[PDB]
Design a binder for this molecule. Structure first.
Ligand code: ZN
Ligand code: ZN
Length: 1107
DNA sequence: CCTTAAGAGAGTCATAGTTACTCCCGCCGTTTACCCGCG
DNA sequence: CACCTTGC
RNA sequence: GCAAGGUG
DNA sequence: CGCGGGTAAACGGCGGGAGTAACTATGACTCTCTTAA
């Protein structure tokens, strides 16, 4: 139980031990340190409100106004939680927000108007049968003699006056009539097969290649390829496959180096388990810690089930090889034709090198066991690479030897018992890295060649998920505002990349537009595709892939998108989607996942028939469970959700979303009621912080893991979800408290130290409330200036600009600085324009679009830190210094204890009577030891005597280090040279190292950077008091030249430039100069820590050991 | 061997904006179904 | 240069 | 493992 | 049948308006002061 601590409780007896520790803060200290784990909550006796945060209860203590628990009355208690309310206002508003499902139910119920007493109650007892018979007879009795006869009586219980009344209802002098209509759905995209011959000229690329090779041979161009293979191919050879495979084998053997052999370099006590855990974690931190970060944050490991290889085999054998007869795509047509000129260009080793650069070097090598690193080692020039690549390309016969690839099962689930199934293993297929690179090259060529529909936002340059999500949210809000019904249908097909039959993609490509050369090339690429299933100590014998694009091959994305395009096309051909403005946007698309946006339930039905047809042609399998959907319907005031019937996707009730229900989409939690469900950020954040806290991750390591791995995870959702500043502030507060506890910093520490970057001296901790707004604004602008004019139009009419302005302000950007969202952005190329034209487009880099930023915040915290009187004294020295801050990131050798107190000293908040005095006025501050008014930290430095000997020993120790280095640099030692100046008094300088005839007078000193002129005053004193001298040393050392410079140092470790001038006068190379400055600074800081330690001993440990 | 000084953030409640509608809503105008004598 | 997302 | 995007 | 004028009652169309639970965001204050492998 959370032990009830009904504050005020002065010094209570800690119930976990019943020990009177002290003030409630002292009780905290107790429970936190020794008696943790046990539950405890401070109670606010008056209101009895309880909080695990003492501070908060103290905040009550004045604030709290008694027993504030009484609940206001009323006469509308909202059914579910019976929250009494003043009026219906409060009631159905509680429905609206707190209890919105029943609210939708009420909305719909009242929605059914069924009002109609517009008739005015004039209605009477007429019968429709009598009305129809009267109408027919009057048609028969049109003003023709003996007109009533039947009318008067055959309508029993009526009068001619009543007949006149009814005629006055319909026809006045006569009867009347009515009419009706009916709509229909749309289908039949399953016709008109188009393939007749080669889409592009059979030799269109072949003829170009022949011409280019002729030009090269005549002019000896730089295009690389084996001569004989191309000679035979031009010669119309029959066994070209044989020869091309032979050359392949030879060149690959060149790349199949002898890859370097692995060069990677009672009795029952639980201590072994803890030591192994600590060892594992420390090693992973030393080694790759991405694995460590996953293990910690996810709380997981690596899994390898032992499911009978026989089974696993049967499954995948029957899956990959299993085929389905592709009938065709009927009328399904995609975007448009594809240009072939993009391929006319021949391969350039420059381009291949380029592509190589854009590779995951850290990738497991294929069966060849050859890596991109290995590959480059073989040919860092891509000369032979272009050679054999062109060999194949021009020939068109990819070697079958390289085809063999390795397959991997990914333990999708976490629970072992779930893992037992085969459904928790996404199969990864990895082939020859050479094959991978060639594939990506051709893939880039194709992607340029074949244009996809804009609506597919997957696997392209545009920023995908953000665009889709923002568009969806907008659309929803826009619709609700516009008071117009709308239907939403999520779709998801299984085995997106796996069920695909090679034959159908063959077909698809046939009509797109492509030279038969590349056609056959791709076929061969996907022809004779064997692989083995790597598992533990066994890889299954070969399996011939006949269905499913090779999982891992760079092509698979492009090919899949290509096969899917026809669907998107046909859907737009329906042009029955939501008529946003002019555009009738039908559906969005990302990779495989897609939606459907019609305007009427029946329009959506039409869409579904189209989809069903598509599956029929493709033989694809969609399911209601695999899919979700929901409908919107406007009211007089608000919108109703799902008011209509659930659909019948694949003849199955599409699972509908109801208010409050959320279904994941691109990692989000789309809720029709509120668009995106508010993400559970605090919960995941706290969980992660707990996991980190409770591990062998010595504090510095905790901070490193945090800043470098944890934050991005939360960044993604926080930014992608419109998040308000207050919640971010709360999260930042949580993080600050947690880290401060981690490193046992004093509570009141200034934030600026925490937030400022390590390079600037700070802890480099993110400030979500300051960072997320900038990311959000960047996304906003990025989407605004998109290529899809539709997306633009949408955002524009959705007046995103106001949000952009507001964010830019919120992130801290100035109103004037607000860029005009319409204007273009900076388009860099990482290449001098000259070099840019020098090369070809295929070798051109990717022009990433630089975007504005509202402001820099790290600098903001830095500035505020500077402004601080106490915690911010002398720090400005450390701004934009790449030397002093270094140890923060590479505090090697420092003891964790030393390092932590080093943080404190750097912050000037170390325990000292002044520090204990700081803030709290009424106290004593006199330096215990000497007399200093404030028992400050600087008086220690020099003023405070007791040290004396230690100060001297440290000083001459540093002098000794520099001396030791001196002889190493052939600087003749003439240090500690007792002198006798004009006063014949000992002015022994630190160092007078002589060389040739130059004698280098030096003055080693280390001063705390209290003021700004510290070191320049030092130097002025150096020269000033030294001055004269000259002659005496001139003859003593027999030197013809004498220096007088100094060597001041920052006590904290600040490295002035004067010592640097000494270094350059010494002749040290620049790189060694930086190395020396860094190391020397760390030594300075360490010996300062020693000074501290000593003093702290002096009096404290003196009393402890000697009472 | 060197320096003058000495809150800073944690935290709660108060109050104003503002969302999101929703509620609604009352008042005047329209529509309905008859209601009545005549060529 | 390290991380993160999604989606296979 | 692959394709993109983002972040310091 | 034709053939006019009356009917007066929902509702809906429209001006507006009026309110509001519950977030979101500043403002104004007060309390806080010791544990490294
Ligand atoms: Zn209270
Ligand atoms: Zn002193």
């Amino acid at each position: 139980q959370k032990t009830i601590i009904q504050l005020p409780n002065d010094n209570p007896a800690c119930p976990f031990c019943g020990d009177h520790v002290g003030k409630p803060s002292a009780l905290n200290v107790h429970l936190k340190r020794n008696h943790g784990g046990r539950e405890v909550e401070f109670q606010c006796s008056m209101c009895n409100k309880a909080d695990p945060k003492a501070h908060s209860i103290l905040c009550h203590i004045p604030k709290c106004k008694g027993k504030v628990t009484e609940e206001p009355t009323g006469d509308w208690a909202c059914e579910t939680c019976n929250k009494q309310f003043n009026t219906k206002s409060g009631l159905s508003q509680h429905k609206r927000i707190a209890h919105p499902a029943i609210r939708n139910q009420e909305r719909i119920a009242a929605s059914q108007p069924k009002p109609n007493s517009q008739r005015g109650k004039h209605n009477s007892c007429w019968t429709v049968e009598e009305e129809q018979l009267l109408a027919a007879f009057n048609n028969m009795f049109w003003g023709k003699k003996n007109i009533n006869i039947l009318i008067s009586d055959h309508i029993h219980m009526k009068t001619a006056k009543q007949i006149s009344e009814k005629r006055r209802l319909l026809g006045l002098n006569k009867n009347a009539t009515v009419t009706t209509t009916n709509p229909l759905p749309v289908s039949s995209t399953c016709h008109l097969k188009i393939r007749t011959d080669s889409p592009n000229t059979t030799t269109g690329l072949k003829d170009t290649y022949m011409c280019k090779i002729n030009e090269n041979i005549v002019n000896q161009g730089q295009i690389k390829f084996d001569s004989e293979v191309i000679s035979a191919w031009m010669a119309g050879d029959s066994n070209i496959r044989s020869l091309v495979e032979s050359t392949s084998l030879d060149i690959l053997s060149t790349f199949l180096m002898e890859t370097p052999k692995p060069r990677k370099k009672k009795w029952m006590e639980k201590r072994a388990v803890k030591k192994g855990f600590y060892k594992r974690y420390q090693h992973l931190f030393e080694t790759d810690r991405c694995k460590l970060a996953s293990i910690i944050l996810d709380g997981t490991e690596r899994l390898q089930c032992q499911i009978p290889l026989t089974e696993i085999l049967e499954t995948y054998k029957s899956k990959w090889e299993t085929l389905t007869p592709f009938e065709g795509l009927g009328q399904f047509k995609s975007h448009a034709v594809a240009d072939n000129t993009a391929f006319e260009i021949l391969l350039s080793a420059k381009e291949i090198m380029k592509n190589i650069k854009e590779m995951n070097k850290n990738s497991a090598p294929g069966p060849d066991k050859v890596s991109l690193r290995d590959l480059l080692l073989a040919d860092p020039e891509c000369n032979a690479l272009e050679k054999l690549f062109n060999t194949w390309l021009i020939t068109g016969i990819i070697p079958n030897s390289i085809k063999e690839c390795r397959s991997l099962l990914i333990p999708k689930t976490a629970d072992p018992e779930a893992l037992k199934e085969l459904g928790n293993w996404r199969p990864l297929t990895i082939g020859s890295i050479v094959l991978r690179l060639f594939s990506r090259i051709i893939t880039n060529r194709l992607a340029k060649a074949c244009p996809i529909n804009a609506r597919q936002r997957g696997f392209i340059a545009t920023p995908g998920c953000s665009e889709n999500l923002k568009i969806l949210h907008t659309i929803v809000k826009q619709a609700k505002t516009s008071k117009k019904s709308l239907g939403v249908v999520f779709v998801d097909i299984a085995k997106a990349f796996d069920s695909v039959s090679h034959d159908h993609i063959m077909w698809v490509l046939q009509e797109r537009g492509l030279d038969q050369h590349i056609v056959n090339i791709i076929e061969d690429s996907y022809k004779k595709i064997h692989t083995r299933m790597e598992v533990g100590t066994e890889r299954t014998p070969p399996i011939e892939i006949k269905v499913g694009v090779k999982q891992g091959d760079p092509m698979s994305p492009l090919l899949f998108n290509l096969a899917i395009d026809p669907l998107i096309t046909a859907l737009e051909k329906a042009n029955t989607g939501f008529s946003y403005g002019k555009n009738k946007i039908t559906s969005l698309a990302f990779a495989d996942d897609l939606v459907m946006l019609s305007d009427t339930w029946e329009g959506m039905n039409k869409n579904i028939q189209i989809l069903e047809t598509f599956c029929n042609l493709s033989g694809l399998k969609v399911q209601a469970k695999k899919c979700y959907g929901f409908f919107l319907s406007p009211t007089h005031d608000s919108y109703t959700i799902n008011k209509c019937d659930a659909w019948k996707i694949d003849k199955d009730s599409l699972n509908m979303i109801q208010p409050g229900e959320s279904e994941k989409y691109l990692g989000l939690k789309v809720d029709p009621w509120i668009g995106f469900s508010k993400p559970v950020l605090a919960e995941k954040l706290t969980i992660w912080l707990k996991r980190l806290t409770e591990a062998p991750l010595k504090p510095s390591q905790k901070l490193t893991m945090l800043n470098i791995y944890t934050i991005p995870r939360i960044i993604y959702l926080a930014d992608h979800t419109d998040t308000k500043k207050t919640l971010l502030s709360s999260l930042d507060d949580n993080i600050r408290t947690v880290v401060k506890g981690w490193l046992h910093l004093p509570p009141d520490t200034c934030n600026g130290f925490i937030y400022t970057k390590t390079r600037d001296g700070g802890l480099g901790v993110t400030r979500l409330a300051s960072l997320i707004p900038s990311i959000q604004a960047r996304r906003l602008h990025r989407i605004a200036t998109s290529e899809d004019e539709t997306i633009r139009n949408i955002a524009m009419a959705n007046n995103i600009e106001e949000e952009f302005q507001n964010l830019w302000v919120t992130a801290g950007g100035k109103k004037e600085e607000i860029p005009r969202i319409t204007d273009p952005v900076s388009i860099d190329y990482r290449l001098p324009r000259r070099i840019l034209e020098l090369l070809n487009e295929w070798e051109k880099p990717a022009p990433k679009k630089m975007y504005p930023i509202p402001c820099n915040w790290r600098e903001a915290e830095m500035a505020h830190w500077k402004n601080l009187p106490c915690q911010g004294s002398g720090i400005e020295h450390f701004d934009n210094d790449t030397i002093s801050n270094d140890w923060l990131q590479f505090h090697r050798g420092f003891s964790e204890r030393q390092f932590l107190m080093g943080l404190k000293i750097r912050a000037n908040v170390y325990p000292t009577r002044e520090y204990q005095g700081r803030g709290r006025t009424n106290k004593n501050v006199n330096c215990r030891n000497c007399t200093a008014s404030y028992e400050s930290l600087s008086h220690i430095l020099g003023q405070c005597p007791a040290v004396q000997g230690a100060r001297i020993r440290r000083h001459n120790k540093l002098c000794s280090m520099l001396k030791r280095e001196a002889k190493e640099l052939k600087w003749v030692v003439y240090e500690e040279p007792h002198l006798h100046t004009t006063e014949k008094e000992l002015r022994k300088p630190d160092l007078i190292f002589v060389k040739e005839e130059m004698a280098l007078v030096v003055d080693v000193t280390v001063r705390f950077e209290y003021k700004e002129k510290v070191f320049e005053d030092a130097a002025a004193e150096k020269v000033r008091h030294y001055k004269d001298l000259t002659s005496q040393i001139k003859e003593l050392t027999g030197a013809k030249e004498i220096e007088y410079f100094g060597f001041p140092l920052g006590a904290r470790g600040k490295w002035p430039e004067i010592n640097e001038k000494v270094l350059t006068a010494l002749g040290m190379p620049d790189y060694q100069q930086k190395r020396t400055a860094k190391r020397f600074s760390k030594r300075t800081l360490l010996y300062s820590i020693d000074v501290i330690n000593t003093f702290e001993n002096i009096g404290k440990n003196n009393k402890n050991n000697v009472p």
